[PDB]
RNA sequence: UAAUUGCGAUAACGAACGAGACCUUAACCUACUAAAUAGUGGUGCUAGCAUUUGCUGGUUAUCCACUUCUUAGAGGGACUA
């Protein structure tokens, strides 16, 4: 199974008609070369670590 | 070890127990595994604790939660019907209880398999209730690892409860038998059930 | 928001402009200094006003300042 | 010979603690054997007060307070310096118990 | 009824007073219940 | 051909400013150091180059911060001035406050005891002067300061004691004051300071004074002539001054560094500034204490960020 | 004049004062062995300041506690906190001072409120 | 800027009361200055069990010292350092 390993470098702000997933920007683990958008439905630091599937997706903004 | 005799001596079992460097009576801290980059400072118990009874204060800041015992985190998430509200000591008899099972489970090694079950059962990527005007679809977001071992600790907590309800079986029998069957993922269990969906209907919603 | 009120604000811009030279950087003895200079009716306020003199003293060890 | 125990019971500080110490040096000053001005806590009466005059608006409550300051010295004399000391004394605010057993 | 202003309601009886809370809330500082908290 | 100072590394244990500093000549292995922690710590030095052996004892005892402390020519004793208007008489040893001296009616800054550790002075913010036996007791009430007192030093006598005890005391009212204890009166009276004086130091044959203070002016007076020397510029505000036992040196702390200087020849042999890790140039810590060894050579010297840091004499190429 | 130390620990209102005499090594809580706790599984609470700088720190002193205010839990916490307390306070007065801090440094490395009471105090209602 | 709270620009420049603030409270003080109407330790008188020191008590005055715990204060303390 593709586990895609994350590290949110940016923390972007919060995003959401609700106001709680976090807009982040985050730097690839295994690849270092690759720099992803993307959403956490969660509470987030910087310098942190995620567990992607789709490292492809970017995220713009959020209703 | 050296013996030390007093005048009130301290009975031999727990000189013996503590000076062979083992944290418990039955258990060590010394063998414990983490699997994921994100889990190992976010589970992270180095603290050998003979009760798993901590008069932790981490709910004054966030992050800090993550470096409170995982077993008394655990322990603590065992008190969650309404009925066993403000017993600790219920809680952390009944962990000690389940340690006393999974160790005549034929597993060598309980505190790595709670941690395995912990590194199984936190669902990498979720959904959110996105608008998109109306009728509102679901955004696959990617859930932090602090609520990824939130979310694993709640599953196995509440699969067991749920499992240990209105059966003869004692909770610490059906929360050693869910943290089994997700210490290594089996899809028997509650928590890793739920995981799969969860990343399931992250996967159909992108 | 911690804002001084006007009283601790006006009493440190005062205090500065006419006796520059015996105040440092450091509270303890700006506030033996508020005791010894100034009659505040109260140590709290003196507190207040001394602390303050204290971080004013701190921005104009730095540059010029609007007084 | 009389030995007396007196007993002090005030709210202000100010007004008990000037009577106890003008008891004390006092005492003192004309050679007598004594305890000194010993301490009951400060015991503090409070009242619990809604909120809530009118029945307009939801129930949320308040509270009164009270601080009760009691002290007390042991002390060993004749008839009249007693007598003229408790005349003396006499303070508002400040109320004042002279006892003569010892039982 | 309340010693102050004939008032069957909003008694204190307690302590042996009887105010009513009204009048007891007025006469309060010259009684010695003074607001402190 | 220099002599050199060197870094010998830091002694860390304090919570406040280290504001005073005391060595022994009974045992050049004991320093004693009173702090704005409220506390003394006394230290069994063992010098390496980066870290210092054992901290020995901490004295808790004074309610708002230790300003000034001495020790005695044996080391068994310790002498502190505070800021609750008293001061106390330690033992190195235990901890032992043997007395406490209760008669100011605000903060001693001051604390110096004579050559046979039998009188005791004590200079406050309340303008007063007092001298004490070894017990406790207030036998002299010396006024005449209109300002602060910074500063109380018994000066070392040259003649044995021939019955003359003389004390020299800095006030902020800008003036230096020397004090005849045989009758209690005052019998000199050093004016030429423009600003506050911090500190006054009595050089080792007792007839050379040196104070300093807001101006940054070294004044040097002749105290056995009673008339005044001259004047050295340490530009910023010196907050104390020291004599070396053996040299013919004067080092002071100002609030950029250390400046060591020399009177024969009349050079300034030093200025002695720290590296500091994260800090602003007007952030930076100064010196406001400072202790001179037994021998001449070694200068331990109290910051402002809680740590005492010590220079060792050598000798360049 | 037996050498004795005298020291305090709290925990939500409950106290327990600890009388550290020289004798030949017994430890007693309430005029009862410590073996013998009221709780069965907060006991070992109350050895961790036993354990934590070894087993023989005990052979030269008694020491006793006296426990009152609160529940079982706040006492057991006030108990270890109060053996904790009088044990550094002997080797502080009795001992060495090295000896003292590397006790100190042993109890902080584990438990920080072995040496420093709970600063959790009852939150006022607010009216 | 929390604020028509200020800096600044300016046919506007003052000045008053609003806001704050005055007031009453909390948590640290092995440092003060102080105790049979609170308590601890030591000592005697005394009980039991072990006896090798020990263990658990009784004695509102047999005396002594303490306030480390309880308690009246004074200070301090914070000033967004
Ligand atoms: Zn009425």
Redesign the interface.
């Known amino acids: 199974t593709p586990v895609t390993l994350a590290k949110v470098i940016k923390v972007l702000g919060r995003t959401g008609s609700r106001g709680g997933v976090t807009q982040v920007r985050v730097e690839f683990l295994e690849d270092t070369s690759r720099t992803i958008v993307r959403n956490v439905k969660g509470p987030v630091r910087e310098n942190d670590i995620l567990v992607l599937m789709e490292s492809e997706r970017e995220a713009r903004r959020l209703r | 070890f050296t013996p030390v005799v007093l005048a009130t001596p301290i009975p031999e079992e727990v000189q013996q127990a503590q000076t062979e460097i083992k944290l418990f009576n039955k258990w060590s801290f010394e063998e414990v595994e983490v699997k994921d980059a994100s889990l190992v400072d976010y589970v992270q118990v180095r603290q050998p604790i003979f009760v798993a009874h901590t008069a932790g204060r981490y709910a004054n800041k966030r992050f800090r939660k993550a470096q409170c015992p995982i077993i008394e985190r655990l322990t603590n998430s065992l008190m969650m019907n309404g009925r066993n509200n403000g017993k600790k000591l219920k809680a952390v008899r009944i962990i000690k209880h389940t340690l006393d099972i999974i160790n005549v489970l034929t597993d060598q090694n309980p505190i790595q398999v709670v941690v395995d079950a912990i590194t199984n059962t936190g669902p990498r990527e979720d959904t959110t209730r996105v608008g998109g005007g109306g009728a509102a679809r679901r955004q696959a977001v990617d859930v932090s690892p602090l609520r990824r071992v939130n979310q694993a600790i709640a599953l196995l907590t509440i699969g067991a409860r749920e499992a240990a309800f209105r059966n003869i079986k004692t909770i610490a029998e059906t929360l050693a038998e869910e943290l089994i069957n997700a210490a290594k993922g089996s899809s028997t269990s509650y928590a890793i059930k739920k995981k799969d969906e969860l990343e399931r209907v992250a996967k159909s919603n992108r | 928001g911690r804002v001084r009120t006007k009283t601790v604000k006006r009493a440190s811009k005062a205090l500065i402009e006419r006796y520059y030279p015996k105040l440092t950087l450091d509270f303890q003895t700006n506030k033996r200094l508020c005791d010894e200079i100034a009659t505040i009716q109260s140590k709290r306020l003196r507190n207040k006003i001394a602390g303050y003199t204290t971080h004013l003293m701190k921005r104009i060890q730095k540059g010029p300042v609007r007084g | 010979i009389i030995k007396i125990r007196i007993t002090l019971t005030s709210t202000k500080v100010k007004q008990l603690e000037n009577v106890s110490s003008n008891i004390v040096k006092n005492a003192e000053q004309h050679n007598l054997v004594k305890k000194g001005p010993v301490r009951l806590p400060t015991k503090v009466l409070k009242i619990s007060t809604r909120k809530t005059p009118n029945g307009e608006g939801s129930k949320t409550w308040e509270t009164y307070e009270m601080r009760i300051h009691k002290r007390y010295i042991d002390l060993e004399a004749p008839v009249q310096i007693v007598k003229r000391i408790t005349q003396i004394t006499i303070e508002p605010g400040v109320d004042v118990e002279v006892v003569v057993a010892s039982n | 009824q309340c010693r102050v202003c004939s008032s069957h309601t909003g008694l204190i009886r307690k302590y042996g007073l009887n105010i009513c809370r009204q009048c007891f809330r007025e006469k309060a500082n010259d009684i010695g219940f003074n607001k402190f908290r | 051909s220099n002599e050199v100072l060197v870094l010998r590394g830091t002694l860390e244990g304090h919570n406040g400013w280290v504001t005073s500093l005391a060595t022994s000549a009974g045992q050049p292995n004991l320093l004693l150091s009173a702090s ?1 922690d409220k506390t003394l710590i006394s230290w069994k030095l063992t010098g390496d180059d980066q870290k210092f052996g ?4 901490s004295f808790k005892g004074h309610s708002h ?1 230790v300003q000034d402390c001495t020790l005695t020519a044996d080391g068994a004793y310790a002498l502190s001035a505070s800021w609750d208007k008293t001061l106390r008489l330690w033992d190195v040893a235990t901890g032992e406050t043997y007395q406490r001296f209760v008669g100011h009616k605000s ?1 001693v800054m001051s604390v110096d005891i004579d050559k046979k550790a039998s009188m005791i002075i004590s200079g406050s ?1 309340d303008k007063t002067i007092k001298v004490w036996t070894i017990k406790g007791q207030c036998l002299a009430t010396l006024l005449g300061h209109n300002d ?1 007192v910074s500063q109380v030093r018994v000066v070392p006598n040259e003649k044995a004691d021939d019955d003359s005890v003389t004390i020299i005391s800095a006030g902020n009212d800008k003036m230096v004051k020397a004090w005849n204890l045989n009758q209690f009166q005052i019998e000199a009276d050093f004016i030429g300071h423009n ?2 004086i911090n500190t006054l130091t009595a050089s080792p044959d007792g007839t050379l004074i040196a104070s300093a203070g ?1 101006d940054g002016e070294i004044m040097l007076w002749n105290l056995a002539a009673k008339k005044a020397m001259y004047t050295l510029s340490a530009q910023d ?1 010196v907050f104390s001054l020291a004599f070396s036992p053996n040299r013919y040196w004067l080092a002071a702390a100002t609030a950029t560094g250390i400046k060591v200087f020399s009177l024969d020849p009349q050079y300034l042999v030093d200025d002695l500034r720290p590296e500091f890790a994260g800090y ?1 140039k ?1 952030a930076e810590p100064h010196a406001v204490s400072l202790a001179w060894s037994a021998d001449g050579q070694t200068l331990f010297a109290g910051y402002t960020d809680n740590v005492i840091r010590v220079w060792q004499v050598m000798t360049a190429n | 004049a037996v050498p004795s130390v005298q020291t305090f620990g709290k925990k939500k209102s409950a106290t327990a004062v600890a009388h550290v005499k020289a004798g030949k090594g017994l430890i007693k809580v309430n005029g009862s062995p410590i073996t013998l706790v009221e709780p069965e599984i907060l006991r070992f609470k109350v050895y961790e300041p036993l354990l934590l700088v070894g087993l023989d720190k005990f052979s030269n002193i008694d020491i006793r506690v006296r426990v009152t205010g609160g529940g079982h839990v706040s006492q057991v916490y006030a108990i270890r906190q109060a053996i904790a307390k009088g044990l550094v306070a002997y080797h502080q007065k009795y001992v060495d001072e090295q000896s003292k801090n590397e006790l100190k440094k042993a109890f902080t490395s584990y438990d920080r409120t072995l040496l420093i009471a709970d600063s959790r105090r009852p939150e006022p209602k607010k009216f």
């Open positions: 704005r054992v901290p020995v004892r911060i903060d913010r602060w600003s506050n807001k505000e602003s007007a």
